[PDB]
Amino acid sequence: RLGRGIGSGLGKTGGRGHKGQKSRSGGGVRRGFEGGQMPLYRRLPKFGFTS
RNA sequence: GGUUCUCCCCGAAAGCUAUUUAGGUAGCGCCUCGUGAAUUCAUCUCCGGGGGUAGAGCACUGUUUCGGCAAGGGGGUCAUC
Ligand SMILES: [Mg+2]
Ligand SMILES: [Mg+2]
Ligand SMILES: [Mg+2]
Ligand SMILES: [Mg+2]
Ligand SMILES: [Mg+2]
Ligand SMILES: [Mg+2]
Ligand SMILES: [Mg+2]
Ligand SMILES: [Mg+2]
Ligand SMILES: [Mg+2]
Ligand SMILES: [Mg+2]
């Protein structure tokens, strides 16, 4: 139970750190986001087919 | 901007790389928890290594002063077939 006082050890920030995307309500990047670069599953080429 | 009860144990970072990136983020570095593993790791002594820094030096690359020797160059006087 985060954000329930100093003694709990998870108060006033809820374990989210300080003013990042993870600290915003509904914040955070999608799966595979690499900071702006095209992710590895897009740097690498497709191969093969499904039989 | 704010995030509400208590105690105990451990305990950071403000670095690297990349980004329409530079008050964001991802991986790594650093933290915690769990599970494994070796006289694994750290320190010292001794031994075996590659350095080319500090310093020094002026053979080399350059730079710099004085003296000696001295072509050569410039100026003047004659001659300038
Ligand atoms: Mg805490
Ligand atoms: Mg944060
Ligand atoms: Mg805040
Ligand atoms: Mg402590
Ligand atoms: Mg780009
Ligand atoms: Mg930044
Ligand atoms: Mg900040
Ligand atoms: Mg920003
Ligand atoms: Mg040197
Ligand atoms: Mg030196």
Tell which residue, A8, A25, A6, has the closest CA to residue A16: A25
Ligand nearest the Cα atom of residue A34: 5
CA-to-CA separations, A28 to A7, A23, A32, in angstroms, rounded = 28, 9, 12
Resolution in A: 3.5
Judge contact between A4 and A11, C-beta under 8 A: yes
User: Residue A43 corresponds to which tokens in the numbers above?
Assistant: 């740097």
What technique determined this structure?
cryo-EM
The Cα A51–Cα A39 span in angstroms is 27
Residue A6, class by beta-carbon neighbours within 10 Å (0-12 exposed, 13-18 middle, 19+ buried)? exposed
Question: What SS3 state is found at A43?
Answer: helix
Query: Does residue A35 reach within 7 angstroms of strand B, measured from its CB?
Result: yes
- In sequence order, the 6+-apart residues with CB closer than 8 A to the CB of A5 are A11
Query: Does residue A3 reach within 7 angstroms of strand B, measured from its CB?
Result: yes
Judge contact between A22 and A16, C-beta under 8 A: yes
DSSP of A1-30? --SS-STTSSTTTTTS-SSSTTTSTT--PP
- A50 Cα–ligand 10 center, Å: 68
